[PDB]
Design a protein around this nucleic acid. Sequence first.
DNA 1: GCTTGACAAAAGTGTTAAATTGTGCTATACTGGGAGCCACGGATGCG
DNA 2: CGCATCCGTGTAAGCACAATTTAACACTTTTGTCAAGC
Lengths: 49, 77
Amino acid sequence: QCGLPKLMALELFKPFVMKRLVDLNHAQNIKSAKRMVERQRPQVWDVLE
Amino acid sequence: SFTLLQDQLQSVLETLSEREAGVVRLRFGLTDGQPRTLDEIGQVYGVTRERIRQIESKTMSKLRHPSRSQVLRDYLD
DNA sequence: GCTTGACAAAAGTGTTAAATTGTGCTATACTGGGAGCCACGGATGCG
DNA sequence: CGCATCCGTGTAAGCACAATTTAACACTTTTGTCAAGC
């Protein structure tokens, strides 16, 4: 195991997070998911988990 | 995302309107690539210039409806 | 629901002016640049 | 045939005329628009 910072991990996994957000209807499309992630809304962290 | 537009804006809204959007495919050249004037898309069939002029406004009003309008909001900056 | 005719605006044809670019000419005499502030390996003459 | 030394190498155009390209203007065709009626 290794500990990875939230800010770093989010930027590395951005595309996976966007896909998962789109699937769970937190964002309407890819641009919406990317904009949501760039603002780092509270719902992004649960998806990243 | 542009390709996803070819999946949404180009396709689904056309399936639910038949020729009301089939003419639009010729209007902006979604097929064969040529945007076409009212006469060109009308002269080959039995529909006049003014009728296509009315149909374009009717389609614009139809697609302004919130149910269709809300979906495409994210594809425009 | 669809068509007819007058009307305003936008898109073509063609002429013309202008700006932009290319080529040629100038006959006192002048005639040969001027810069400039190393060590290593492979080969050939000599002993 | 081996060694010492030499070499190669990583300060000064401007004008005239002709030809091409680009814009400005004018009119004409086409397009979209409006009302009204068939």
